[PDB]
Scaffold this active site. Structure first.
Site, PDB file in Angstrom:
ATOM      1  N   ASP A   8      30.817 -24.895  44.339  1.00  0.00           N
ATOM      2  CA  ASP A   8      29.929 -24.005  45.089  1.00  0.00           C
ATOM      3  C   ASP A   8      28.774 -23.625  44.166  1.00  0.00           C
ATOM      4  OD1 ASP A   8      29.604 -22.179  47.617  1.00  0.00           O
ATOM      5  OD2 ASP A   8      29.319 -20.856  45.887  1.00  0.00           O
ATOM      6  N   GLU A 760      28.770 -27.915  47.558  1.00  0.00           N
ATOM      7  CA  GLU A 760      28.019 -27.085  48.495  1.00  0.00           C
ATOM      8  C   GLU A 760      26.909 -26.443  47.679  1.00  0.00           C
ATOM      9  OE1 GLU A 760      30.207 -23.738  50.026  1.00  0.00           O
ATOM     10  OE2 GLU A 760      28.529 -22.890  51.142  1.00  0.00           O
ATOM     11  N   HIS A 829      28.518 -20.281  76.571  1.00  0.00           N
ATOM     12  CA  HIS A 829      27.846 -21.303  75.780  1.00  0.00           C
ATOM     13  C   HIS A 829      27.401 -22.427  76.706  1.00  0.00           C
ATOM     14  CE1 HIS A 829      30.456 -19.103  73.023  1.00  0.00           C
ATOM     15  NE2 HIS A 829      29.652 -19.462  72.039  1.00  0.00           N
ATOM     16  N   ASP A1317      26.358   9.949  52.702  1.00  0.00           N
ATOM     17  CA  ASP A1317      25.135  10.564  52.199  1.00  0.00           C
ATOM     18  C   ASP A1317      25.321  11.178  50.812  1.00  0.00           C
ATOM     19  OD1 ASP A1317      23.019  10.059  54.054  1.00  0.00           O
ATOM     20  OD2 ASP A1317      22.806  12.162  54.587  1.00  0.00           O
TER      21      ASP A1317
END
Length: 1353
Positions: A8, A760, A829, A1317
């Site tokens: 990879d 890859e 699809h 936060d």
DNA sequence: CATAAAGATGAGAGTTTGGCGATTAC
RNA sequence: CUACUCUCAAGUUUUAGAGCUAGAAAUAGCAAGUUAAAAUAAGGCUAGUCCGUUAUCAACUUGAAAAAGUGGCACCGAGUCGGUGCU
DNA sequence: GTAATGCCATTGTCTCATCTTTATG
């Protein structure tokens, strides 16, 4: 035994894994060298190398050119002083010496502290008489009296040192540059061109209006207000608007059908003007030229503000006026503030820390910051008029040396220099003798084509010398061989075609290149007339006629002009439809019409004998930018044309380069056909192949020719092979590391080469789709946005985006969709998942039920296509859907899916389009396979398989091997393993498809052997591999079609021809999960010596600190300031003794000393002398250890640290989170965006809800890991507290924030992160002491071989 | 009179992670 | 689609642009502020109007260097790898 | 005196939001 390697390759990591035949990763025992008690470690053959990104050479280039510029400027000053020396010695003996020693303090200064005159009296008198240098310059330009030679040198040196830009070529004078004369010339040309109802302008003050400091539109309106006979929409008003920098529209002035917009700053103005001029004639050309000149005048007028003719030096006079205005405005400001606002006066003029006036002058406060600080103060006080109109116009209290001065051309400084030299010419004879010399010093500029003036010892230089003498600006013309230098410049700057080396690439505006791309775009155009009812490709004669009649007559050819002026005029076709191109042809013959405008000989442009000449002219205009060398290179063509079009041709300039060469386009020839690429583009019979298709198609010799020449261009070393690649230096670094990883892996396996190496290569969009929806709605006319307003943020949802894409209508049924019931509606699809794995919007539709597609497992039936073709044609021509989506939607009308479509799907899934991947596979193949036989045939022992990331990604998504990059760095190694698995499965299942993935010469087996005829005829007894075109079906146990029928596949998948089991759906998935679950994955951070800049570039003020670094040898930083913050190249372990206390008793120490980049050469030359200079005594020379950045240390309980520096550490451990938590996190964070079937989504949703306690378990896991390893208890307490604070929040959000929490535990440098936060600031490891008694671990590139050294000693 | 398009005036940013000085604690 | 040439303008830093009035100082009132020189990776030898921030780099042996060499195999497991048999 | 816990970083570049002006129906 037999094994394969999975890789990879990325820009910051290289994943690697070794697999066996049963898809298992071997675990082996490796020897450990060193002096510890550990002699063996068990390691899994899976891992990932980590390394810093490779950097581009841009910064180095900028720095280098800057150094050259500084050097050459200093040399200019040295030339000036060399001319002034002998006559200055009679006036002042130590003038230049005092100027050179200006920086030193009075203690270190051998001469008087006063630079210019040496006494304080004359200095005060000089500064009071001239408070700025521009005062002295303006005097020397406007005074006939004799001046002191020192001041003359100061003026000349100031004009030479900062000489101005060189964008404008040639002489500059008020006759062709001042606004007044050019305005009179403009209105004279205007009145001459018409004379009937002319405009008379005498009272107007064009200078006062155009040069005033105001906005463009207000200047335009004020000038129109000054002309009662003209209006803003008139011709003259539009010309002034064009000259000021606006975007005027000339449609109303000439009633044109098509909008003609002009912008002088736009690069395409000229050809646009040529189109405009073509409509109204070329009589107005000089008018617009004067307008262009006027525009340049206005820019020149912004610098030449004081051009009142009283002075002869516009710039110096303008700086004086700026000084005076600054003084007036300053005194007025102090008066107003003291009168009205006594308070806060110190904050504006004394404090200097908060960007006041003292901060504007003495502090680091820019002009914009000072304006931002004083705007409310001026707004609050009364009587603040005039200062605010100056503040908004950015002309309040300006300095004379600001960022605007970059616009000042050098011809101005040349003018003032000539003026000063002429005024003091008779008084000083050597100025008469050396006038042209000084002028040459200011004006001389090294040409682009000459480059560095080296003498053989420069890696970047190429110029040739016709003598052996120091090159100066005066003898440059007779020492520098400009011809040979330009030839070498051409040879260096010509890049070679990536497809075919040893052949230069043509310019981007080459005639042959434009013909090539025009024919390449035209050949993919299909036309349907009224009667044939079938798409027909353009014939050769049709292409030639279309090109000659349209492309050689207009720069832009649109589909409307194509049907109107060709099909109707020659073919007599009333109605034509074109699918190949959209609104117009992107390609154009720009150069053809340019040359036609230059020489005005259409026949000469089409003579096939003059092709090479025109290509040479275009090449010359592309390569060079200097007027003189262009004139030199165009003298051979003087007899063809002369004195008008040759001059106009020299002013023309082209920029850019193509990607293909001449030999590729019209050189290499197919042996059988005997036609080049361009010949194939012009004529190819029924089917027309494009460029990429001729490279791909193996039936022709072009691919063979490109392949057999590839190895000629390359070299023998690995470094040359990697350097030749077309990519960023980062991916090249990754490629080299990958090669080394392969080498180490095959060394580890007893020098056995693998059977397979799988490789890859690892807000704007919302705006574009929003604009797409708005354009489609405006074209159609259904006001869905009025009744249901939406913003680009909400359009990320799939079902809502599809709802707006489909005009708010069902695709299969003639009914409106329910806006607030999309959960009951399904996304279908167009082409089922069983045939192709395409989950993009290009292949998705929204409908209430997917049963309306009909009973077939193919595209939707003809009964729906016939009903919805009209609505789909309206959605097609309205740019709501693309051409491919319409083709797939209407495939049942043309029979349905076909063998060519399935083969296209296979090629879309299995072939890698990226060239870099093919070149990497070539390198690894060449390095792995090197045996031969008796014949001249290459034995391919190792197969290099190239895979697409989509395959492994879909493999992860389909079988829940989910990837979460934020947890640890294991996912690179895991991706490598899965690549190995998928590659081996594919090469075992489909050997005949080797040519698609495996690199090298291979058989050309076509669609017939592979694609089956029908579902029942799978063809196990006839070699057919698959009826359904999706290659990844054999991994799945069940296949759900688009109807709901569940097709079943065997539990054990075997190859049909050889009877070898390729996949066991039970044992192999369990094996894969077990491999992905392994906690020991070899993660190695490449230890790298740090290089680059010595330190921060900031030049800090003087300070009583020994951290400061001298800027020059004798510039003691305690007196002069300097740099701080050096970068450590590497750290050095020193065991020695240091003096302690008054008595200087020697005490043994062991510490890390950071060797800075600047110190490196000195330290390596003699380490002992360097260390003794640092204070160390009795150094153990043989115990010194070099420790580059990221050196790895282990202390206790498996806790690891990496060396960041000599005084700081990074985290060294990886959190091996169990697979079930990884999958849970992926699922929880992807709650709304599951993008799967409804049943599947329901299973995932129920899994998340049933396993919500995994949130607490993951938090516990992070806590125990951090307590064992990280040791940041303040941040851990913060984390646990925040997690308890937000246990009420939804599962998705808690998942997303745990994802943010893994940066606390990640390998590498500590980093800040946010939990909801609450910000959690990084906890740093600001001491390297502990690792002086830890175990240092030196690691191989794979991390398998290691040596552990116990630094207790 | 209303809506749409273009230009201008402030808005922030423009990585990350190592150095260094202030600070705090023993 | 990397690489490359030429060049500009700012920024920053030490000095020159005398500070004036009180007060033992501390500290207060004011006057002026716009500019210039020099450096802009320390430096290097090959001494050029050249080069100095890219690429490259675990450990150990031999070499100034390019560079060659050095680390046993299965099985049961899996918290950063452990255990057992063979050799 | 020694060892553990906020700001800054050489650049000439971006892009987004609101208000004002001009054009068309």
């Amino acid at each position: 035994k037999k094994y394969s390697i999975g890789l990879d390759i990325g820009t910051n990591s290289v994943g690697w894994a070794v697999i066996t035949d049963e898809y298992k990763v071997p675990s082996k025992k490796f020897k450990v060298l060193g002096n510890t008690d550990r002699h063996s470690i068990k390691k899994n053959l899976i891992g990932a190398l980590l390394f810093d990104s490779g950097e581009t050479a841009e910064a180095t280039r900028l720095k280098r050119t800057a150094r050259r510029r500084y050097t050459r400027r200093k040399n200019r000053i040295c030339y000036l002083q060399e001319i002034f020396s002998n006559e200055m010695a009679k006036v002042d003996d130590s003038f230049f010496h005092r100027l050179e020693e200006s920086f030193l303090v009075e203690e270190d200064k051998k001469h008087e502290r006063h630079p210019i005159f040496g006494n304080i009296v004359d200095e005060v008198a000089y500064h009071e008489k001239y408070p700025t240098i521009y005062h002295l310059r303006k005097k020397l330009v406007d005074s006939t009296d004799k001046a002191d030679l020192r001041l003359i040198y100061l003026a000349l040196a100031h004009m030479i040192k900062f000489r101005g830009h060189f964008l404008i070529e040639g002489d500059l004078n008020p006759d062709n540059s001042d606004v007044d004369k050019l305005f009179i010339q403009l209105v004279q040309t205007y009145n001459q061109l018409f004379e009937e109802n002319p405009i008379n302008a005498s009272g107007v003050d064009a200078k006062a209006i155009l040069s005033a400091r105001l906005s463009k539109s207000r200047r335009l309106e004020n000038l129109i207000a000054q002309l009662p006979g003209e209006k803003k929409n008139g011709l003259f008003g539009n010309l002034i608007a064009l000259s000021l920098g606006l975007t005027p529209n000339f449609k109303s002035n000439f009633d044109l059908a098509e909008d003609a917009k002009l912008q002088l700053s736009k690069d395409t103005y000229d050809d646009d003007l040529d189109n405009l001029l073509a409509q109204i004639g070329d009589q107005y050309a000089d008018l617009f030229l004067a307008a262009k000149n006027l525009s340049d005048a206005i820019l020149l007028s912004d610098i030449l503000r004081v051009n009142t003719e009283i002075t002869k030096a516009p710039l110096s006079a303008s700086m004086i006026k700026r000084y005076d205005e600054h003084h007036q405005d300053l005194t007025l400001l102090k008066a107003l503030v003291r009168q009205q606002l006594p308070e806060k006066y110190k904050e504006i003029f004394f404090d200097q820390s908060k960007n006041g006036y003292a901060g504007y002058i003495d502090g680091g406060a820019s002009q914009e910051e000072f304006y931002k600080f004083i705007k409310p103060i001026l707004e609050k006080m009364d009587g603040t008029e005039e200062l605010l109109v100056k503040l908004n116009r950015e002309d309040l209290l300006r300095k004379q040396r600001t960022f605007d001065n970059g616009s000042i051309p050098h011809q101005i400084h040349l003018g003032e220099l000539h003026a000063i030299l002429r005024r003091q010419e008779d008084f000083y004879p050597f100025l008469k003798d050396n006038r042209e010399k000084i002028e040459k010093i200011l004006t001389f500029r090294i040409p682009y084509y000459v480059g560095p003036l080296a003498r053989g010892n420069s890696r970047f230089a190429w110029m040739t010398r016709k003598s052996e003498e120091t090159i100066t600006p005066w003898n440059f013309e007779e020492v520098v061989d400009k011809g040979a230098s330009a030839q070498s410049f051409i040879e260096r700057m010509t890049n070679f075609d990536k497809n075919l080396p040893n052949e230069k690439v043509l310019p981007k505006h080459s005639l042959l290149y434009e013909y090539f791309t025009v024919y390449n775009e035209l050949t993919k155009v299909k036309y349907v007339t009224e009667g044939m009812r079938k798409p027909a490709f353009l014939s050769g004669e049709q292409k030639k006629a279309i090109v000659d009649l349209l492309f050689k007559t207009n720069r832009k050819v649109t589909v409307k002009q194509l049907k109107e002026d060709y099909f109707k005029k020659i073919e007599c076709f009333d109605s034509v439809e074109i699918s190949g191109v959209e609104d117009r042809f992107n390609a154009s013959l720009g150069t053809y019409h340019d040359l036609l405008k230059i020489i005005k000989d259409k026949d000469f442009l089409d003579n096939e004998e003059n092709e090479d000449i025109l290509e040479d002219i275009v090449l010359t205009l592309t390569l060079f930018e200097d007027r003189e060398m262009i004139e030199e290179r165009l003298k051979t063509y003087a007899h063809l044309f002369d004195d008008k079009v040759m001059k106009q041709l020299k002013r023309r300039r082209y920029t850019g380069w193509g990607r293909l060469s001449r030999k590729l386009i019209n050189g290499i020839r197919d042996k059988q056909s005997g036609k080049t690429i361009l010949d194939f583009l012009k004529s190819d019979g029924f089917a027309n192949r494009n460029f990429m298709q001729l490279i791909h198609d193996d039936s022709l010799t072009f691919k063979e020719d490109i392949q057999k020449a590839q190895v000629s261009g390359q070299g023998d070393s690995l470094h040359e092979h990697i350097a030749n690649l077309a990519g960023s230096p980062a991916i090249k670094k990754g490629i080299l590391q990958t090669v080394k990883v392969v080498d180490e892996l095959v060394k580890v396996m007893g020098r056995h080469k693998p059977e397979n190496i799988v490789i890859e290569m690892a807000q704007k969009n919302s705006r574009e789709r929003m604009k797409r929806i708005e354009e489609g709605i405006k074209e159609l006319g259904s006001q869905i946005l009025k009744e249901h307003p939406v913003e680009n943020t909400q359009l990320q949802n799939e079902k809502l985006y599809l709802y707006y894409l489909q005009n708010g209508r069902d695709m299969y049924v003639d009914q409106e969709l329910d806006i607030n019931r999309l959960s009951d509606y399904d996304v279908d699809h167009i082409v089922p998942q069983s045939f192709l794995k395409d989950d993009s919007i290009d292949n998705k539709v929204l409908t209430r039920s997917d049963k309306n597609r009909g009973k077939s497992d193919n595209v939707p039936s003809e009964e729906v296509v016939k009903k919805m073709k009209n609505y789909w044609r309206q959605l097609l021509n309205a740019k709501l859907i693309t051409q491919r989506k319409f083709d797939n939607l209407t495939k049942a009308e043309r029979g349905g899916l076909s063998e060519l479509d399935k083969a296209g799907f296979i090629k879309r899934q299995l072939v890698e389009t990226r060239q870099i991947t093919k070149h990497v596979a070539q390198i690894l193949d060449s390095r792995m396979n090197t045996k031969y036989d008796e014949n001249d045939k290459l034995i391919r022992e190792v197969k290099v398989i190239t895979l697409k990331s989509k395959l492994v990604s879909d493999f992860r998504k389909d079988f829940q091997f989910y990837k979460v990059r934020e947890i640890n760095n294991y996912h690179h190694a895991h991706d490598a393993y899965l690549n190995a698995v998928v590659g081996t499965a594919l090469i075992k299942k489909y050997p005949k498809l080797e040519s698609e993935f495996v690199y090298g010469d291979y058989k050309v087996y076509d669609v017939r052997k592979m694609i089956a005829k029908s579902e029942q005829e799978i063809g196990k007894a006839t070699a057919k591999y698959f009826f359904y075109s999706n290659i990844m079906n054999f991994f799945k146990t069940e296949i759900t079609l688009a109807n709901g029928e569940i097709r079943k596949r065997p539990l054990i998948e075997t190859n049909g021809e050889t009877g070898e089991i390729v996949w066991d759906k039970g044992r192999d998935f369990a094996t894969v999960r077990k491999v992905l679950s392994m906690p020991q994955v070899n993660i190695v951070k490449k230890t790298e010596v740090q290089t680059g800049g010595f330190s921060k570039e900031s030049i800090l003020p003087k300070r009583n600190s020994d951290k400061l670094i001298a800027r020059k040898k004798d510039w003691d930083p305690k007196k002069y300031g300097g740099f701080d913050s050096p970068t450590v190249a590497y750290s050095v372990l020193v065991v020695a003794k240091v003096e302690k206390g008054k008595s200087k008793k020697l005490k043994s120490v062991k510490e890390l000393l950071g060797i800075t980049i600047m110190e490196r050469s000195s330290f390596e030359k003699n380490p002992i002398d360097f260390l003794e200079a640092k204070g160390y005594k009795e150094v153990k020379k043989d115990l010194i250890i070099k420790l580059p950045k990221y050196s790895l240390f282990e202390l206790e309980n498996g806790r690891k640290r990496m060396l960041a520096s000599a005084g700081e550490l990074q985290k060294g451990n990886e959190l091996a989170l169990p697979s079930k938590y990884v999958n849970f996190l992926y699922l929880a964070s992807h709650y709304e965006k599951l993008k799967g079937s409804p049943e599947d989504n329901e299973q995932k949703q129920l899994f998340v809800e049933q396993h919500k306690h995994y949130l607490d378990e993951i938090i516990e896991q992070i806590s125990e890991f951090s307590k064992r390893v990280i040791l940041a208890d303040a941040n851990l307490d913060k984390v646990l507290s925040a997690y308890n604070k937000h246990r009420d929040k939804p599962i998705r959000e808690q998942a997303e924030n745990i994802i943010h929490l893994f940066t606390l535990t990640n390998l590498g440098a500590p980093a800040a992160f946010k939990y909801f936060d609450t910000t959690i600031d990084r906890k740093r490891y600001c001491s390297t002491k502990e690792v002086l008694d830890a175990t240092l671990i030196h690691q191989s590139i794979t991390g398998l071989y290691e040596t552990r050294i116990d630094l207790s000693q």
